[PDB]
Symmetry: C3
Subunit: 645 residues, 3 copies
């Protein structure tokens, strides 16, 4: 209210009575300021329930001109027990981004740009009151991650990567964060555009102006060429360069970094461009002092007092540092501007501003594990390059699903040009994830692991000596639908076990050579057809045995030679024929029929005639009958399957 | 001894003569102090053999009260050649933990708590003279590692992780390190419990008290929730939170970190609790100045001079900073307390103390290798989750064995719910070990490697084109007991070789389809039994050959049809039967017998009669005899095995 | 030129007129100096095209003695607008290595030593004007990498690892960088070798000398033992120690680090030696002040004024810090040495100098990928330990080939003593490379990956459910010369497919047991020979069928028993024999011949006689003829192969 006169402070509560003596306000464009206010006043006790966590309003004035009325947060404050004759305080102010320093997350941003990624940490826990004075387009980040760090640390490092900076466009209603870059972004007052300069010849003057200049210049790197890798296009022209030479000795000495974190070429030519431009602020920076109360970090002006036709040009004030000083009364009615002071760091226009990086790159010093993800009913979610998708064990955003990550590559055992090893991670099983050069924005899947839900395949903690690979039917995980190859290396009990869950189809292009040292037992269920082109040879050192349980059937287009070295019997019920190596043919039946279309000869070298001689019976020796054969076949697999109870 | 009067210093050698003027002693609870002593004295030369590496004794006095007689180590000292009129020195003191700064290890601690882990680096190279004033229980660490770092750096970071701090309980006999936490741990003198406060109205007073207060306060993070991963229980409620709000604006803004390094839940609720509590020291800290010689870092007191009913409460002095000043003689007989000075940082009780972390977390910036271990006679030491145990190549503690590590997980190629790849590392062979997020307390096994003792399986540095897997018999490593699958990819000489060290058991659930393009040679040693359920079909385009070396035996329950398209001979020594497609049956023997139980018919379409006609002999064409057959069988494998000499 | 008198500065342009007042020159042996020159002069505008990037020449003089005429680079310079009454400037000088600070590379050095590795970054972008005063030999580095960092940062960290340091041997022609170590490397003037010392009793003297001493000493670590791993010799005595004790309390307290980055033993005993020696500079350092204008960092001298027989010995000045001061005219004709000042840090000889390390070790915080390399025509380049060679995606040095790297080990899935897994990376396919403990000089290959040129083997992005391994013919990558094992896990359509690109050779040591649940179809191209030692048993539950397309041939040394349970026919064109289980033998032909060498009997139990009875024809039932059999064989694989158009 309180127009007696003199001191008028509010927004959130500020007494008009409470006087101010000193301040000390540093800042840099793209950094926080701090205003070292030392107060003194009447009040003994005021609360802490807001004022420590909420604004103050300051009012710096160039009357008849660009008032600078201020409004910003209190973040550290104190009182002082030196004088019980009147209060004394301290009060350092810092802007609203500071209140994103004392905070911390682990959060993933996807398919967003790195201006409007920063809008959300603002908006979700804050206002819309910031502004946009950007002009070119930047990169729309596929996958950006605020890793472990503080939201304030997060936003600024990204702004620094992209050349965005900021300042506070000072407003009489609502405070403002100016998201900016380049000439056509900043702005300044009228008639004020050109500010004075004068050596105050009698020590001091009744006037506001400049009384100091210094132009410091260091040598700066000449060119920062960049390079990255691109597996999408593993042949492409990866290199990118930037160059801003000004004409002098020992200038164009080059820099070079690998991972500049780019995918597409032109974007890497921007990044080299932004980081090259920041370092060239240092090339030429200028140092001033004046008693003028209009300018501050971010402001543009033009100097006219220390002249050169085009030395003193446009000037963006980067870091204004200033002071207030007074021990003022209502005495000597009047009293005017009790002394002030300022100091300055400026630049130009065709020579433009960028921010120097200075922050640890979120320090992911080793691998994590993650669940390879997709909720129920699913088992396989890959892509064309054998990529999968994961949730890291830090997600308060979904029941991890196809949105938990970008696609992540897998590190196979053996991988070549459309040939080599492949086992893609199923959904729900855990992996090892590394990070290329340790960047939390660049996962890569580098191995698998077993846990309590995803348990080892075999008998553990027991047959450690077994090894192999066993798969699982997909869509349907029944604890035994699987193809497996398993080598067991336990002495005396070694084995190689191959299990085809359905069908097996072995193809050998030239020759094959099965050698078994003891026995083979082959048992096929329904049918075998074996076919061999040219010749089939079968040699058995001892007894060859064959039981047919149906009709046996043998066709030979030419000749079938049946040779014995002892004896040949064909026994067929009551009709038994027997050929012997001594040469005695024996035949028994129950009748016989002998027919020749043409002729028949029966001859000897002894006697023949007819009747009496051939045995009364040459018996079939028991076996002959069909029932007997049955069981020599059927003594097979008619097995039990009792049933449980 | 030397009671003239005035200055009385000893333990390790201190002259009574040698006067002291200045000191400057800073400390913080949980940090080292340093006392900037500038001496002057008689002596020109005294040695360096101890005094630089050993104590001094100081004596600060509040006579008629709490004397503070001191005893601590010298760690940096100097003399000064300004005056040959009397000596001048410097002497900065620091406590005994400093003498664990200039040291360094790489050592593993197992199944120990993180109070009494610190007891050993103390005790093994030092004393038992420290104390314990702790009250709650902390975590008993399964696996804790002092990685590369200094013993002083090791102990303090752990104390900082667990909320333990310290101070020195000042003793007239033997110096003391107070391992502490919470109210019921600290302590203080009597009647001294309440110390004075007075603005020394005539500049100065004949009295000891306080003459300054300042209560600085910053805004602090509102809550640090934590989260970790737990593969033992990969479904569990990992999250843990902590909260200490005091009522003000912009307060309850949260923090969040992942790996807080916890296994079990409650312990993570402590860690969030300890780290949240440290940051809330900064919330409210108080700054004092007095001329009183009783208090120091760690001391508790209660102020009474600057009052508020409950503003000035209990006060644990966190960091006392103080001064001595004198140029004193035995003149103006008397002379009293030549001036002193102190400064202070205090806290309360229901608002309790914790340490701010500030030390690099032992910087394991990449993987190591390690030997997977167990001394002789052993080959396989795993557990239920397919874990093994390693020694890292830095052990001066055992011939590495089952105690070298905690169990470490392995990174398989393919791992799923009781299905997937397994090859567990044998004892003696080397691996690659990564560290989760780069923490030296969290190894994980991530790959294998060959070395000079553990050599590549094949012909190296030669058949680079071969690949595969070969196992080894376990318990018995004979350079050829093994199951192997080996693909060789050299053009013209390609091969797939499968080797079963004992037994092979292939199971196909539906169908199988072996196609070989050239030849197969199958040779079984002892027996084959092949059985097919339904039908067996065998078709050969050209000559089918069979040699039996024993008894051939063929049974068919129904019909055996034997069909030829040219000719059928059965030759049996001197009895040869020959059926021909034109229809001429030829039979030769040495006798024949023909019998029919019932009837016999012999018919023609030409003539028959008896005798003269059938050949004198239709010869067996040489082959018939048993000796011949032998060699057609036996021309097999009766091989040599000469013998070596 | 300009001998009026007084001030004589040049090389690159320096006016004789332009006066100098202050300087402030700090340095440390093994670091850059900086000379804080504040100028004042006539000139308003001089250019910037060289002078900022090029030298100045200073001339410090001890007339009648060791002149110190200087010549060094300007790197940051400024002017000042305070006085338009005469100019004012600043000008900080720094040596020529500074101009390797504002630069950056990622470059590999191979089979070179770490003195003459530094020669090239010098020589390729600079002069030969440096010098060599080294005496012992150092390590010839197999593989050294300047990773990301600045050339100045690169050279100094390596010099610090090896104990080399430097200073500038000040020359009247051409400036000099002294690459040095040990006593016999430094040097100094004559008669000057011993410099004075005097307390300037009337405040000041007409003379140059010392007027201050201080000998500061801290306690230092007692011994730094080292240890590394050596897979070449995985059993060897890795440990190495160093020790320099001087006699005092709390001294011999040890250090220990693992990776000291050594291969061979003695070299690690040097590294422990160099790093132990640096820390023992701090053990004893000495602080001086004089008005003498001959000495500077690197200079050796001997003090004689503050005596002790052997306290004041040889003195290598490590860091001289000095000053100039004057506001001089040509007035009071004469005027002499307008005042100067210096300050000092010295050491000795038998106690020798080394550099303290202080630089981030190039921070490779995670893995890269790389192409495993060798240009066209090649597919496999390995060594004896299964190592390959890579180019990292940052090479501007070759079309990456056998010189791109040192040999790098691969991380197999399973690796043991001449047994275990092997798939060595082919040339052109990409890998994952980690770095042991994150050192850019120690790659290790830790996994594979697919990209756009090196594509997945199968149907992607489709049969994700298939897995396996497929190789490729080497020397000849035809998109189907390969051995493959492939498990397909899709329900109802599961399969195990084995493909041998040429030959397959399965060996089973004891038994084998093929069980197929449905059918087997085996088709061999040319020949099969099957042989079984003892007994072959074949049982078929239903119909056994055999078609021979050539000559069938069966030999049995003993007996062939042919048994039927229904009937046996042998049909051979027009001659059909039929034996039946009731006992009726039926024979039909077109003639028959029956012969017995000895006797013949034909008998019955009914009637016989001759003629009338046996059938007019028992027909062959159609099948008998050879054409029919043909197609029962030949209905096989006479397939089409139409042709494309
Ligand atoms: Cl009034
Ligand atoms: Cl108010
Ligand atoms: Cl600054
Ligand atoms: Cl008041
Ligand atoms: Cl607000
Ligand atoms: Cl879109
Ligand atoms: Cl969000
Ligand atoms: Cl763009
Ligand atoms: Cl607003
Ligand atoms: Cl507005
Ligand atoms: Cl091009
Ligand atoms: Cl340009
Ligand atoms: Cl990166
Ligand atoms: Cl591109
Ligand atoms: Cl542009
Ligand atoms: Cl008045
Ligand atoms: Cl411009
Ligand atoms: Cl930092
Ligand atoms: Cl849920
Ligand atoms: Cl979704
Ligand atoms: Cl499943
Ligand atoms: Cl099953
Ligand atoms: Cl044979
Ligand atoms: Cl008979
Ligand atoms: Cl019978
Ligand atoms: Cl006396
Ligand atoms: Cl003494
Ligand atoms: Cl502090
Ligand atoms: Cl004396
Ligand atoms: Cl002691
Ligand atoms: Cl226990
Ligand atoms: Cl121990
Ligand atoms: Cl507990
Ligand atoms: Cl003791
Ligand atoms: Cl005691
Ligand atoms: Cl619950
Ligand atoms: Cl609480
Ligand atoms: Cl961790
Ligand atoms: Cl729990
Ligand atoms: Cl509690
Ligand atoms: Cl006296
Ligand atoms: Cl309390
Ligand atoms: Cl640090
Ligand atoms: Cl031993
Ligand atoms: Cl043991
Ligand atoms: Cl073994
Ligand atoms: Cl063998
Ligand atoms: Cl067929
Ligand atoms: Cl005949
Ligand atoms: Cl014959
Ligand atoms: Cl003259
Ligand atoms: Cl000139
Ligand atoms: Cl220093
Ligand atoms: Cl002039
Ligand atoms: Cl030059
Ligand atoms: Cl050579
Ligand atoms: Cl080069
Ligand atoms: Cl050597
Ligand atoms: Cl030169
Ligand atoms: Cl020369
Ligand atoms: Cl030995
Ligand atoms: Cl020695
Ligand atoms: Cl290393
Ligand atoms: Cl060695
Ligand atoms: Cl030596
Ligand atoms: Cl004159
Ligand atoms: Cl010496
Ligand atoms: Cl640093
Ligand atoms: Cl090219
Ligand atoms: Cl080459
Ligand atoms: Cl190929
Ligand atoms: Cl093919
Ligand atoms: Cl059987
Ligand atoms: Cl008939
Ligand atoms: Cl017919
Ligand atoms: Na806010
Ligand atoms: Na004037
Ligand atoms: Na040039
Ligand atoms: Na679920
Ligand atoms: Na048939
Ligand atoms: Na049986
Ligand atoms: Na000790
Ligand atoms: Na008074
Ligand atoms: Na609220
Ligand atoms: Na042994
Ligand atoms: Na039989
Ligand atoms: Na043979
Ligand atoms: Na140079
Ligand atoms: Na005198
Ligand atoms: Na001792
Ligand atoms: Na090419
Ligand atoms: Na034959
Ligand atoms: Na057909």
């Amino acid at each position: 209210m309180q127009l007696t006169r003199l001191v008028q402070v509010d927004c959130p509560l500020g007494p008009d009575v409470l006087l101010l003596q000193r301040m000390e306000g540093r800042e840099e464009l793209g950094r926080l300021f701090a205003y070292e206010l030392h107060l003194v006043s009447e009040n003994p006790n005021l609360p802490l329930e807001q004022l420590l966590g909420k604004p103050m309003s300051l009012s710096l004035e160039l009357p008849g001109g660009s008032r600078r009325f201020f409004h910003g947060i209190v973040a550290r404050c104190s009182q002082v027990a030196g004088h019980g004759q009147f209060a004394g305080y301290q009060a350092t102010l810092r802007p609203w981004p500071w209140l994103l320093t004392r905070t911390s997350d682990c959060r993933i941003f996807q398919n967003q740009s790195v201006p409007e990624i920063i809008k959300q940490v603002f908006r979700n826990l804050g206002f819309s009151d910031f502004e946009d004075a950007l002009t070119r387009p930047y990169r729309e980040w596929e996958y950006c991650v605020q890793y472990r760090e503080t939201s304030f640390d997060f936003i600024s490092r990204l702004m620094e990567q992209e050349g965005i900076y900021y300042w506070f466009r000072h407003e009489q209603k609502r405070h403002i964060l100016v998201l900016s870059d380049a000439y056509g972004a900043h702005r300044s007052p009228g008639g004020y555009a050109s500010v004075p300069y004068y050596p105050p010849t009698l020590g001091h003057r009744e006037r506001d102006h400049f009384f100091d200049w210094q132009m410091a210049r260091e040598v700066q790197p000449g060119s920062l060429t960049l390079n990255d890798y691109d597996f999408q296009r593993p042949g492409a022209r990866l290199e990118v360069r930037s160059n801003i030479a000004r004409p002098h000795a020992a200038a164009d000495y080059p820099l070079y970094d690998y991972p500049g974190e780019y995918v597409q070429s032109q974007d890497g030519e921007q990044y080299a461009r932004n980081r090259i431009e920041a370092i060239q602020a240092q090339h030429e920076r200028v140092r001033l002092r004046g008693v003028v109360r209009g300018i501050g970090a971010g402001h543009l002006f033009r100097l006219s007092g220390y002249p050169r036709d085009d030395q003193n040009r446009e000037y963006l004030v980067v870091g204004a540092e200033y002071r207030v000083v007074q021990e003022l009364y209502e005495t000597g009615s009047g009293g005017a501007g009790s002394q002030f002071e300022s100091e300055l760091d400026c630049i130009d226009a065709s020579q433009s501003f960028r921010l120097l990086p200075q922050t640890p790159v979120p320090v992911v010093r080793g691998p994590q594990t993650a669940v390879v993800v997709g909720p129920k009913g699913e088992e396989i979610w890959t892509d064309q390059y054998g990529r999968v998708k994961v949730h890291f064990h830090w997600d308060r955003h979904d029941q991890s699903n196809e949105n938990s990550s970008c696609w992540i590559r897998v590190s196979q055992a053996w991988a070549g040009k459309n040939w080599g090893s492949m086992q893609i991670p199923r959904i729900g099983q855990e992996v090892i994830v590394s990070f290329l050069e340790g960047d939390p924005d660049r996962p890569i899947i580098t191995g698998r692991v077993y846990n309590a839900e995803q348990t080892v395949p075999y008998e553990l903690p027991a047959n450690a000596t077994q090894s192999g690979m066993k798969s699982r039917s997909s869509k349907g995980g029944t604890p035994a639908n699987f193809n497996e190859i398993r080598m067991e290396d336990k002495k005396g009990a070694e084995q190689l076990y191959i299990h085809a869950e359905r069908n097996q189809d072995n193809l050998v292009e030239n020759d094959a050579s099965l050698s078994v040292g003891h026995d083979r037992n082959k048992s096929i269920g329904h049918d075998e057809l074996a076919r061999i082109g040219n010749n089939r040879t079968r040699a058995v050192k001892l007894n060859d045995t064959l039981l047919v349980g149906g009709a046996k059937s043998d066709s030979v287009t030419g000749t079938y030679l049946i040779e014995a070295g002892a004896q040949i019997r064909l026994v067929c019920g009551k009709s038994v024929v027997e050929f012997n190596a001594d040469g005695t043919i024996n035949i028994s039946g129950s009748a016989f029929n002998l027919y020749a279309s043409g002729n028949g000869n029966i001859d000897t070298g002894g006697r023949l005639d007819l009747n009496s001689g051939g045995a009364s019976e040459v018996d079939a020796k028991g076996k002959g009958v069909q029932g007997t054969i049955d069981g020599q076949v059927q003594a097979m697999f008619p097995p039990p399957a009792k049933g449980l109870e």
